[PDB]
């Protein structure tokens, strides 16, 4: 069974850095390219990074080239984001999400992990 | 950016009732080469999202098939024939058309 989970979440300091995990298992992690997803309270959607099999980042929202960072351990079966000047519009609900190529999209999400903006 | 409007925002449903939601595309999605790269996400409540419908029809795994999806270009459509409980939640539409991917507004199934 595709399971995918997210941890790390919670209350971050404005203007500082936080890495998200996210833990993949029933399917060869390494064959597949992921992602991060996020969703805000107004529970608008929006896609934070892509990363390919290879552990290359194939995609960053514009706004976000500068403080996201989207790799992965393969060993650990692992994949990671790293934000960094984190403002307020920061505070969504993060989800890792698999690239399935027959969709060519998202084909499964984790749970989430909340990460809540302070100052 | 391609926008995804999907009407209506809020749509209050009786169980057993058809159902059609909407996915406006600002752009077309058959001006490239990926035609209708257009998917369907529900998502109940303290659940996290799950694939519904991919590529305007294709229904996915774990999906009933009360649920169809329609449409070509910019105006697509998904219908649930007999509307259950466990549909209720938050639809969003999806495209890959086009770079980058871009997700809709969402449509709330909300018993009345
Ligand atoms: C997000 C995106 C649309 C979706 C695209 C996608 C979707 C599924 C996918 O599946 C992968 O396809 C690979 C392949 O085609 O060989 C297989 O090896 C993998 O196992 C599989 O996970 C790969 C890709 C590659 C680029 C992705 C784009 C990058 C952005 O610019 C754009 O917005």
């Known amino acids: 069974q595709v399971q995918l989970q997210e941890s790390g979440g919670g209350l971050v300091n404005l203007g500082g850095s936080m890495t998200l995990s996210c833990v993949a298992s029933?399917?060869?992690?390494?064959?597949?390219?992921m992602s991060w997803v996020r969703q805000t309270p107004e529970k608008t959607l929006e896609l934070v990074a892509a990363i390919n099999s290879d552990g290359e980042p194939i995609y960053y929202p514009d706004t976000l080239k500068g403080r996201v960072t989207i790799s992965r351990d393969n060993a650990k079966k692992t994949l990671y984001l790293q934000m960094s000047s984190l403002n307020f519009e920061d505070t969504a609900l993060y989800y890792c999400a698999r690239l399935n190529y027959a969709v060519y999209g998202m084909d499964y999400w984790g749970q989430g992990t909340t990460v809540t903006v302070s100052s | 950016d391609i926008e995804l409007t999907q009407s209506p925002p809020s749509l209050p449903v009786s169980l057993g009732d058809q159902v059609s939601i909407s996915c406006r595309s600002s752009?077309?999605?058959?001006?490239?080469?990926?035609?209708?790269?257009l998917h369907w996400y529900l998502q109940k409540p303290g659940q996290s999202p799950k694939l519904v419908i991919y590529k305007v029809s294709n229904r996915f795994s774990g999906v009933p098939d009360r649920f169809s999806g329609s449409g070509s270009g910019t105006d697509f459509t998904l219908k649930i024939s007999r509307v259950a409980a466990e549909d209720l939640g938050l639809y969003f539409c999806s495209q890959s058309s086009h770079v980058p991917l871009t997700f809709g507004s969402g449509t709330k199934l909300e018993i009345k």
């Open positions: 029933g399917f060869t992690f390494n064959t597949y390219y």
């Open positions: 752009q077309s999605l058959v001006s490239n080469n990926r035609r209708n790269y």
